[PDB]
């Protein structure tokens, strides 16, 4: 009943419910994905959908989130699924590679399924791949971002009152603010010596967005995304 870096944390353990995997991603008919890879794309799609449900359910539980006018529950999730997967990927992807210099050739999609940079390439998307791991995966490595911090940022990326068309802007500003207060406090009461930590963290957020918008450029390109049905799917999933 209170939004805290504490609840948000124990709330990470809670595993999804592989009930209905809604098609947020799939290979459209007559898409321009070359047949011999039309099997692989689709399998990755199947992976990203499972994940989106893990996010729609995680969001639903977050303290107060469900006391939001339902119209809004949908716009905040629709408004962030994609940035939220890249964040979880770059987080996950931090262990696989500690690699003049060798670019980190690995990227983790979900446990025990790690994309390799060479097929990132063969797909032409090699550039968003390096951006993920260097701008996010790697820069989090150095920063030594702890798990508390990482669930805080999510909480923050979800509770965006800047989403167009929300029925109650204030009802989501307060939550977001409750997370800045938490994030700032934790940050001092922890790495006290670390000044500018609170801002060094909040700064991954605009990159996470550029990289996020980037991904869609590609996703729509190959007709992989189906943004039309999304809201409905989310709508359905909440309930």
């Amino acid at each position: 009943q209170e939004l805290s870096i504490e609840r948000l944390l124990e709330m990470e353990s809670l595993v999804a419910d592989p009930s209905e995997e809604f098609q947020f991603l799939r290979v459209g008919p007559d898409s321009n994905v070359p047949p011999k890879f039309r099997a692989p794309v689709s399998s990755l799609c199947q992976i990203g959908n499972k994940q989106i449900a893990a996010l729609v359910v995680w969001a639903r539980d977050i303290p107060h989130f469900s006391q939001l006018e339902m119209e809004d529950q949908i716009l905040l999730i629709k408004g962030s699924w994609n940035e939220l997967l890249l964040f979880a990927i770059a987080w996950r992807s931090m262990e696989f590679l500690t690699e003049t210099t060798s670019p980190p050739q690995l990227m983790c999609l979900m446990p025990g399924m790690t994309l390799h940079r060479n097929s990132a390439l063969q797909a032409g998307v090699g550039q968003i791949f390096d951006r993920v791991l260097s701008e996010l995966s790697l820069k989090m490595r150095t920063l030594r971002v702890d798990q508390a911090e990482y669930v805080a940022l999510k909480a923050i990326i979800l509770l965006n009152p800047d989403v167009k068309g929300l029925k109650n802007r204030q009802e989501v500003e307060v939550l977001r603010e409750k997370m800045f207060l938490c994030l700032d406090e934790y940050c001092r009461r922890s790495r006290s010596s670390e000044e500018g930590r609170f801002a060094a963290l909040l700064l991954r957020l605009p990159a996470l967005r550029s990289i996020s918008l980037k991904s869609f450029e590609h996703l729509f390109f190959f007709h992989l995304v189906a943004d039309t049905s999304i809201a409905g799917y989310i709508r359905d999933a909440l309930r």
């Binding site: 977001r176 603010e177 700032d184 000044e195 500018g196 609170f198 801002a199 957020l205 996470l208 967005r209």
Partner: protein
């Protein structure tokens, strides 16, 4: 509750003053199809001051030559939204950029970019709600110039600079709020803009690209800066 150093205090000073000067609404306007040319010419002048503002800034020269020009291509389109947005009059719900035929729900509509002005204004109400200072805004602009772009020679540099600014705006909003906790929230909502300025900035590039292959007169200056 450390007050600003003397160098911090002095910095905030150099910037408030050295901003009014490049007061976006420029007078050099001497223009001696659809009026797409107004929207367009304006933008040009505007971007032009921005590039200049982007210089007298206690950082630049330090950055390389070609490296910096990367900082402007990115920084410029976003930072322009900030200047237009700083003008949004609450009373009428519109940008009053010396209310030239510059950017209005009208011209924009006549020049077939109907959907766009709508979005600009959303982010306008949004920014108008935080009630930023003049220091807020200044510092903010700078923190956007030195925001880390893709392809920077030594991003480690642009990052210690930008952090200098970043600390001043924190210490500033800190005293301004006498060590209460609200400060972090205030500070937060500001960095919070930096992330939304990126969508608009990019929503932009994708706009040139659309006008570009729909046959339109986009000035070799814009096409340059925000290449297409």
């Amino acid at each position: 509750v450390p007050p600003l150093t003397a160098n911090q205090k002095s910095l905030i000073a150099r910037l408030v003053y050295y901003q009014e000067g490049y007061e976006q609404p420029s007078e050099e306007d001497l223009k001696r199809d659809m009026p797409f040319r107004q929207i367009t010419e304006m933008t040009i002048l505007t971007v032009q001051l921005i590039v200049e503002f982007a210089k007298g800034l206690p950082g630049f020269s330090k950055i390389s030559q070609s490296d910096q020009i990367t900082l402007l291509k990115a920084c410029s389109s976003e930072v322009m939204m900030l200047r237009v947005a700083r003008r949004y009059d609450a009373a009428t719900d519109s940008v009053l950029f010396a209310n030239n035929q510059a950017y209005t729900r009208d011209n924009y509509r006549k020049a077939g970019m109907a959907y766009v002005i709508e979005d600009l204004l959303h982010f306008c109400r949004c920014m108008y709600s935080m009630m930023m200072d003049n220091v807020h805004y200044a510092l903010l602009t700078a923190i956007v110039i030195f925001s880390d772009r893709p392809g920077l020679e030594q991003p480690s540099l642009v990052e210690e600079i930008q952090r200098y600014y970043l600390n001043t705006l924190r210490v500033y909003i800190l005293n301004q709020n006498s060590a209460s906790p609200r400060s972090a929230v205030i500070f937060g909502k500001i960095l919070g803009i930096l992330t939304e300025i990126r969508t608009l900035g990019m929503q932009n590039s994708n706009m040139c690209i659309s006008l570009k292959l729909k046959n339109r007169k986009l000035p070799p200056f814009l096409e340059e800066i925000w290449d297409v």
